[PDB]
Amino acid sequence: VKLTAELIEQAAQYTNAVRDRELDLRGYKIPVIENLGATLDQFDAIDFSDNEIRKLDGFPLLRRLKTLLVNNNRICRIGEGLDQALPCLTELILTNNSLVELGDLDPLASLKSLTYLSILRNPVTNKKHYRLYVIYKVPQVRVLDFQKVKLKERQEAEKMFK
Amino acid sequence: MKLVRFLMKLSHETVTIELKNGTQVHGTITGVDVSMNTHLKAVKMTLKNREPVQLETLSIRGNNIRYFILPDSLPLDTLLVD
């Protein structure tokens, strides 16, 4: 059950709780996120929860994409061309993923508009100084794992590994 | 006598419309109503100090249109006869 144009044209699309145009693509078990050109950047949020996506890549240019729900998936790697395809990506929910190393968070630093990031329920969050490395690598993010970044955490991230 | 009947008979013609804010929209006129509601298809709009954008459809009101631009090969002498 791969993501095609007929699956995106038959999927439900409505208004979310934040008054944004969201398309519900849950319950599809798509192994790879592709063929997203049929939406023509008419959705403000993408609900791709409960899927089997392994890599968050292969997305076309969508300037209206501001929220991406990748919860309950097996995402273990992030694409390096995420900034060239989503310049206005501000919300990224990557809870309960397959990220084990902090080096997968290195392509996530290119998103300058990203402010809300969720990396909870992951083996990469259980490593030593994971939050300090995420604050040092991504200074544009203001809320990490439902927690506001303070000045002391930014000073601790800028002190170590400088 | 009435310019609305002359504007309504100018369908399927590539014209341009300049608004009061400096935005010029060039496209094929497909629908004209009694209130000068210009409905065009495959138009190109250029605003003031902005980039031109191409749209598949556009609907401009009559009160927002400041000036119009017709081609030189338009039969204005034959279309004026009611």
């Binding site: 979310n16 934040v18 609900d47 927690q147 | -």
Partner: protein
Amino acid sequence: IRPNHTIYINNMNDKIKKEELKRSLYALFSQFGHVVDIVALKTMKMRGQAFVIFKELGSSTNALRQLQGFPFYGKPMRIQYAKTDSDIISKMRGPNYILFLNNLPEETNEMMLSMLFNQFPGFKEVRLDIAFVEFENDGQAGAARDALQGFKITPSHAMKITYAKK
């Protein structure tokens, strides 16, 4: 308190904005299921509290069980079931196959037993301190037997659900 599609979380940080807290609650509730509505106020009566109403009651129950006492913006929010039904949900609404129930309350009618069995999909019939519930599907009957084993309904007594024999 009976389980419902709306889960109310309280004891949260009231210093954040309303839209940011609503977006954070929606991003927290999207991992457990589709969030239909999010009611969040910042007045003197509803300070520091919000609620999320989902489509399915099982996703709301899983979000209330998993995020019970989770730290939200520095303060551990407490999640619980709603007292009344939501307006959006009211607007949108309007192993073996046989399972043996023991220690059931006699004051409960057939409508309460149907609402308790409605977490599982459509069953064949219901029989009425002992009760017998038979489902049309074997996996649905197994999920209903695994879910109702020690359920929180009429807390003066404890309800026990077991599989029927031949």
